[PDB]
């Protein structure tokens, strides 16, 4: 599951718990807000990634104009994904727990099935919200990738799904072969209670393979040396992105009219699996780089984070909203800024901060659970 760090021990965990208890206090002398005062929406946009970064691809129209405009106005950039054309629930796991996949063993396939059940009292961004205000959504089977079990153990009062739960979507409509993002967005609006501070964990389905769309007909796409099938999949996918682009803009515009501080963490989990490796040419790294933005309905700062991991979203959320952190999220803020996927793995500073994270990550998964004795490590 995961390798034990050489220096894993009860004292090494104590050293870490104290260090970041103090760092949390220092950071908190400058952070103003409390996360529990914002309504937060974690929005996994299935397979969303700007094809402009695919070198050998040409699209007749810009299919992500609105989303790119949103990225310019607030904290936004590229997210490094751990897989290609799949692995949805693994990125999802990393956003909630902030434990990076790249520190686990490569033999792990699905974290929701092989790690989460082995976690004693998993800590998540959702724990700062009341159970009655924790909401999950996914237009498919609630049991896919063990999600129903995950959100039950996290105390979620609702899990809207096409099947496998008491909760259902309303006014279901299809764009393409699957449930539209419009349907998902409006179901989020249907449940936003301004009197309560809520947390939403959303996993869309519109742009999940297979892709079929004949409109907008003017949008056509092609790639160098693609087959007819590859070109047609790319065209259908591009057409479907154009709908998600417009509906995402509308969705955010409707959040501006709600009297409640709302922040959205939007990101594609991975590129669609419709490109051959040749499509990337001189930049094979673009095979695993999706788009993300952290956007609030009030005024938005724009923090400089052009490349981060799915596990960095919560720490970036706290920074964007100037919210006070816990000792745990103080460590994750040190990771976000000084030891994430944008830094060299050979830097001594990166190694040190990553050693702290690995010990913590080992402790709460298949380790001894020393952190149960440091009772303030996960509290603000
Ligand atoms: Mn996916």
347 alpha carbon – ligand 1 mean position (Å)? 32
Element spanning 181, H or E: helix 181-191
Residue 352: CA count within 13 A, CB half-sphere: 8
Q: 3-class DSSP state for residue 41?
A: strand
169 alpha carbon – ligand 1 mean position (Å)? 20
Q: 3-class DSSP state for residue 163?
A: strand
109 alpha carbon – ligand 1 mean position (Å)? 14
Is the Cβ–Cβ distance between 230 and 209 less than 8 Å? no
Q: How far is CA 54 from the centre of its chain?
A: 22
Going along the chain from its start, the domains and CATH numbers come out as 10-373 (3.40.720.10)
* List of residues 6+ apart from 60 with CB closer than 8 A: 218, 219, 220, 221
141 alpha carbon – ligand 1 mean position (Å)? 14
283 alpha carbon – ligand 1 mean position (Å)? 22
User: What residues form DSSP beta bridges with 201?
Assistant: 42, 136
Residue the block writes with tokens 């909760």: 167
Is the Cβ–Cβ distance between 202 and 44 less than 8 Å? yes
The count of other CB atoms within 10 Å of the CB of residue 320 is 22
Residues lining ligand 1 (ion), CB within 5 A? Answer: 46, 88, 269
87 alpha carbon – ligand 1 mean position (Å)? 6
Is the Cβ–Cβ distance between 223 and 54 less than 8 Å? yes
241 alpha carbon – ligand 1 mean position (Å)? 14
Contacts 24+ apart (CB under 8 A), 151-155: 151/201, 153/116, 153/122, 154/96, 154/122, 154/124, 154/126, 154/127, 155/126, 155/131
Put the strands of the sheet holding 39-45 in their side by side order.
158-163, 134-141, 199-203, 39-45, 262-268, 289-296, 76-80, 307-309
273 alpha carbon – ligand 1 mean position (Å)? 10
DSSP class per residue in 273-313: TT--GGGGTT-GGGGGEEEEEEEESS-------SEEEGGGH
Rounded distance between C-alpha atoms, residue 249 and residue 43, angstroms: 14
């Amino acid at each position: 599951g995961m390798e034990k760090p050489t220096n894993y021990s009860q004292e090494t965990i104590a050293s870490i718990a104290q260090k970041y208890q103090k760092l949390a206090e220092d950071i908190n002398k400058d952070r103003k807000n409390n996360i529990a005062d914002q309504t937060v929406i974690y929005l996994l946009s299935e397979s969303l990634s700007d094809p402009d970064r695919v070198s050998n691809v040409t699209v007749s129209h810009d299919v992500l104009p609105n989303i790119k405009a949103i990225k310019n106005s607030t904290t936004a950039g590229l997210m490094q994904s751990d897989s290609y054309g799949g692995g949805t629930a693994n990125m999802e796991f990393q956003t909630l727990t902030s434990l990076p996949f790249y520190n686990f063993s490569s033999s792990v396939s699905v974290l929701y099935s092989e790690v989460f059940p082995k976690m004693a009292k998993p800590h998540t961004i959702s724990e700062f919200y009341q159970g009655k205000n924790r909401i999950a959504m996914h237009p498919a089977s609630a049991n896919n990738f063990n999600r129903k079990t995950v959100y039950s153990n996290l105390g979620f009062s609702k899990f809207l799904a096409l099947s496998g739960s008491k909760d259902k979507f309303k006014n279901i409509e299809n764009v393409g072969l699957l449930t539209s993002d419009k349907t998902v967005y409006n179901n989020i609006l249907s449940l936003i209670n301004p009197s309560e501070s809520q947390f939403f964990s959303v996993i869309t389905m519109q742009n999940h393979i297979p892709w079929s769309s004949d409109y907008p007909e003017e949008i056509v796409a092609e790639g160098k040396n693609f087959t007819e099938e590859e070109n047609h999949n790319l065209t259908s996918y591009a057409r479907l992105l154009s709908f998600t682009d417009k509906e995402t803009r509308a969705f955010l515009e409707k959040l501006t009219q709600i009297n409640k501080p709302i922040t959205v963490v939007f990101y594609g989990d991975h590129l669609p699996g419709l490109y051959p490796d040749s499509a990337f040419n001189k930049h094979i790294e673009n095979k695993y780089l999706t788009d993300y933005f952290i956007w609030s309905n009030g005024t938005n700062e724009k923090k400089n984070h052009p490349l981060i991991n799915s596990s960095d979203f919560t720490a970036a959320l706290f920074e964007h909203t100037d919210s006070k952190v816990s000792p745990y999220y103080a460590l994750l803020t040190e990771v976000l800024n000084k030891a994430s996927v944008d830094k060299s793995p050979d830097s001594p500073e990166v190694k040190a901060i990553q050693n702290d994270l690995k010990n913590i990550q080992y402790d709460v998964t298949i380790g001894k659970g020393y952190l149960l004795k440091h009772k303030t490590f996960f509290k603000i």
